[PDB]
Design a protein around this motif. Structure first.
Motif, PDB file in Angstrom:
ATOM      1  N   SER A  91       0.795  -1.246  -0.020  1.00  0.00           N
ATOM      2  CA  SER A  91       0.080  -0.031  -0.050  1.00  0.00           C
ATOM      3  C   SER A  91       0.915   1.036  -0.046  1.00  0.00           C
ATOM      4  O   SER A  91       1.913   1.115   0.111  1.00  0.00           O
ATOM      5  CB  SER A  91      -0.934   0.078   1.119  1.00  0.00           C
ATOM      6  OG  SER A  91      -0.282   0.006   2.444  1.00  0.00           O
ATOM      7  N   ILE A  92       0.193   2.322  -0.120  1.00  0.00           N
ATOM      8  CA  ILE A  92       0.680   3.734  -0.172  1.00  0.00           C
ATOM      9  C   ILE A  92       0.231   4.371   1.257  1.00  0.00           C
ATOM     10  O   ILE A  92      -1.129   4.612   1.217  1.00  0.00           O
ATOM     11  CB  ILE A  92       0.602   4.422  -1.318  1.00  0.00           C
ATOM     12  CG1 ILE A  92       1.308   3.579  -2.280  1.00  0.00           C
ATOM     13  CG2 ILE A  92       1.466   6.016  -1.166  1.00  0.00           C
ATOM     14  CD1 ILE A  92       1.185   4.411  -3.759  1.00  0.00           C
ATOM     15  N   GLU A  93       1.010   4.803   2.160  1.00  0.00           N
ATOM     16  CA  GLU A  93       0.389   5.536   3.107  1.00  0.00           C
ATOM     17  C   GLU A  93       0.976   7.031   3.259  1.00  0.00           C
ATOM     18  O   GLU A  93       1.858   7.299   3.021  1.00  0.00           O
ATOM     19  CB  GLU A  93       1.105   4.642   4.732  1.00  0.00           C
ATOM     20  CG  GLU A  93       0.339   5.439   5.621  1.00  0.00           C
ATOM     21  CD  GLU A  93       0.718   4.872   7.159  1.00  0.00           C
ATOM     22  OE1 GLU A  93       1.878   4.196   7.300  1.00  0.00           O
ATOM     23  OE2 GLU A  93      -0.222   4.928   7.899  1.00  0.00           O
ATOM     24  N   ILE A  94      -0.323   7.718   3.746  1.00  0.00           N
ATOM     25  CA  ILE A  94       0.018   9.313   4.006  1.00  0.00           C
ATOM     26  C   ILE A  94      -0.030   9.473   5.507  1.00  0.00           C
ATOM     27  O   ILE A  94      -0.889   8.788   6.052  1.00  0.00           O
ATOM     28  CB  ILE A  94      -1.050   9.920   3.513  1.00  0.00           C
ATOM     29  CG1 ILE A  94      -1.475   9.662   1.826  1.00  0.00           C
ATOM     30  CG2 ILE A  94      -1.089  11.601   3.643  1.00  0.00           C
ATOM     31  CD1 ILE A  94      -0.355   9.638   1.110  1.00  0.00           C
ATOM     32  N   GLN A  95       1.132   9.949   5.939  1.00  0.00           N
ATOM     33  CA  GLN A  95       1.253  10.073   7.334  1.00  0.00           C
ATOM     34  C   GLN A  95       0.409  10.921   7.961  1.00  0.00           C
ATOM     35  O   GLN A  95       0.066  12.060   7.378  1.00  0.00           O
ATOM     36  CB  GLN A  95       2.817  10.421   7.413  1.00  0.00           C
ATOM     37  CG  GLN A  95       3.494  10.840   8.808  1.00  0.00           C
ATOM     38  CD  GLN A  95       3.492   9.468   9.734  1.00  0.00           C
ATOM     39  OE1 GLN A  95       2.820   8.489   9.693  1.00  0.00           O
ATOM     40  NE2 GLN A  95       4.619   9.134  10.566  1.00  0.00           N
ATOM     41  N   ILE A  96       0.055  10.687   9.290  1.00  0.00           N
ATOM     42  CA  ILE A  96      -0.604  11.465  10.342  1.00  0.00           C
ATOM     43  C   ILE A  96       0.152  11.711  11.311  1.00  0.00           C
ATOM     44  O   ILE A  96       0.437  10.523  11.920  1.00  0.00           O
ATOM     45  CB  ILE A  96      -2.054  11.326  10.467  1.00  0.00           C
ATOM     46  CG1 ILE A  96      -2.836  11.258   9.111  1.00  0.00           C
ATOM     47  CG2 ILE A  96      -2.545  12.086  11.650  1.00  0.00           C
ATOM     48  CD1 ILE A  96      -4.267  10.965   9.306  1.00  0.00           C
TER      49      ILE A  96
END
Length: 213
Positions: A91-96
């Motif tokens: 997957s591709i994760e967008i950080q928070i």
């Protein structure tokens, strides 16, 4: 001036812009551990580091959500997930993250809030608000073209086709060892997920909506 309770946060209801809530009110269209995730009083929150996933896969979409951090929150939004069990390399994760915690100065910029984690960071640091405040993040996922908006600022624009290496970013910087697949070779269709509580501090989400383009 000092008013909050008389200002609208949108120019119009997102419903009329074509957006629909990602998850049902009872989470019946989500895959999660009910001991981890609750959806109560409009607010979605996790008490462990396990994720919540859509049951259907998505491509060519705009995901618009709000999130609130506490001190040193660590979480994220996962897109294009082809294997929920083995999501990290799939997957591709967008950080928070609560970038305001000084701890985050110990990690590369492209690991911080709003980043396409380990691959491309924000064009401007400390765009996330402080703990206790609602943030608005809008992820446009149009095949290989990824655009991230955070609190009204266009912080990331990335064409995944540029990531021909699984180990080296186009700028020569390191990709985390545990994210080995060249992002140029990643499917642009998958489950959507919210990472749980990866820190000891809490993450809250609300108004998670999706526009199918």
């Amino acid at each position: 001036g000092s008013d909050k309770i008389h200002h609208h946060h949108h120019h119009e209801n997102l419903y009329f812009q074509g957006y629909r809530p990602l998850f049902d009110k009872d989470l019946s269209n989500a895959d999660y551990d009910s001991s981890v995730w609750t959806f109560k009083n409009g607010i979605l929150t996790a008490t462990a580091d396990q994720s919540i996933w859509t049951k259907v896969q998505y491509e060519n979409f705009i995901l618009d959500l709000e999130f609130k951090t506490d001190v040193n929150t660590n979480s994220g939004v996962v897109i294009y997930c082809t294997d929920k069990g083995n999501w990290i390399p799939s997957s591709i994760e967008i950080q928070i993250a609560d970038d305001h915690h000084p701890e985050w100065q110990s990690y590369p910029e492209y690991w911080r809030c709003g980043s396409i984690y380990g691959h491309k960071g924000a064009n401007e640091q400390l765009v996330v608000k402080k703990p206790g405040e609602w943030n608005r993040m809008i992820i446009t996922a149009k095949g290989q073209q990824i655009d991230i908006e955070l609190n009204g600022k266009h912080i990331v624009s990335a064409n995944l086709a540029d990531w021909t290496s699984g180990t080296t970013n186009p700028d020569g910087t390191e990709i985390p060892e545990w994210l080995p697949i060249p992002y140029a070779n990643m499917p642009t269709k998958g489950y959507i997920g919210l990472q749980g509580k990866h820190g000891e501090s809490n993450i809250w989400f609300r108004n998670i909506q999706l526009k199918q383009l």
